[PDB]
Amino acid sequence: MIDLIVSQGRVADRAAWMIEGAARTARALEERYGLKGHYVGEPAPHADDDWSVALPQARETLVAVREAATESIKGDNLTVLVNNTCSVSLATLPVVAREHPDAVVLYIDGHGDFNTPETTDTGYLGGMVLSGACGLWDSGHGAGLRPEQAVLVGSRDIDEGERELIRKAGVRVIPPGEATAQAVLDAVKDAPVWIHIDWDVLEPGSIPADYTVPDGMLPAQIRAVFEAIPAERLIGVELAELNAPADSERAEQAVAVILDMVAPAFDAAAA
Ligand SMILES: [Mg+2]
Ligand SMILES: [Mn+2]
Ligand SMILES: [Mn+2]
């Protein structure tokens, strides 16, 4: 079975429509799979605040997501989190690492999200998520994910300083052109798997651009990963950072593509 948890509280959001994009994604999954999501948190406007301000503002939402994710992970369902921002995972990844200390996290993102308070150029909490879960800095929500068990998938054009933090910590990076389903399967070895996706991993627009080599990952590559992870080894999936307004045609088209990508894994868990 699938347990759907949806964040609707601000967690450092700097984009206007990621809370709405999460809501629309959750609605599409509810309709397709016959689920009702557990919605957590109260919306608030986006702002360009420092992580040191945004993080305590998000405490209530993050604690409530932690509690819901803990309950889902303790059972025997596929835990699906539809999150406004990657920063929600500061609460979920420590739970995953505690409950499944052998799990590999596939952190699928166009960015590394591996900055610390000392290295961030923008102050953005969302750029500090994977490093916080791995304990390079203290988010107040725990850590415990071993960097040797974290794999960045689809990341590219990483700042040279952040890239060396990643390398020093032992986090592997599989860029889009190397991120075939088999390359990802080979990186997880015999471990159970947690998948975290930031949609900025995807190549922008043009749908299939037949004569251009993409810089990002294509939807078919994401779908292939979901097809390749065995259902009995998939712990959970987080879907984050769809910036699409409510009631827009854009959100309708985006969620259709999302449903296509996740279907292999979600269909198997529903069955
Ligand atoms: Mg390789
Ligand atoms: Mn991200
Ligand atoms: Mn990103």
The resolution of the experimental structure, rounded to one decimal in Å, is: 1.3
Q: Do the strands 104-108 and 150-153 form a parallel or antiparallel pair, or are they unpaired?
A: parallel
CA of 178 to the centre of ligand 1 (A): 6
Burial class of 36 by CB neighbour count within 10 A (0 to 12, 13 to 18, 19+): exposed
CA of 271 to the centre of ligand 2 (A): 30
Backbone φ/ψ region at 54: left (φ over 0), alpha (ψ -120 to 50), beta: alpha
Domain of 172, in residue numbers: 1-271
Cβ distance 180 to 221 under 8 Å?
yes
Query: Cα torsion for 215, 218, 222, 227, to the nearest 10°?
Result: -130
Find out whether 200 is annotated in a ligand binding site. yes
Separation between Cα atoms, residue 70 and residue 66, nearest integer Å: 6
Separation between Cα atoms, residue 80 and residue 13, nearest integer Å: 20
CA of 76 to the centre of ligand 1 (A): 33
Tell me phi and psi for residue 21, to 5 degrees: -65, -40
Q: 53: which residues sit within 8 A by CB, 6+ positions away?
A: none
Cα 125 to chain centroid distance, Å, stands at 14
Question: HSE (CB half, 13 Å, CA atoms) of 119?
Answer: 20
Find out whether 267 is annotated in a ligand binding site. no
Separation between Cα atoms, residue 212 and residue 269, nearest integer Å: 35
How many CB atoms are closer than 10 A to CB 193?
A: 24
Find out whether 198 is annotated in a ligand binding site. yes
CA of 152 to the centre of ligand 3 (A): 11
Q: How many domains does the chain have?
A: 1
Separation between Cα atoms, residue 47 and residue 29, nearest integer Å: 28
Over the range 84-117, which residues count as b (16 or more CB within 10 Å of their CB) and which as e?
A: bbbbbbbbbbbbbbeebeebbbbbbbbbbbbbee
CA angle 154, 270, 150 (to 5 degrees): 30
Cβ distance 59 to 125 under 8 Å?
no
Query: How many angstroms separate the Cα of 118 from the Cα of each of 97, 124, 144, 172?
Result: 25, 12, 20, 22
Neighbours of ion ligand 2 (CB under 5 A): 86, 109, 113, 198
Residue type present at position 158: I
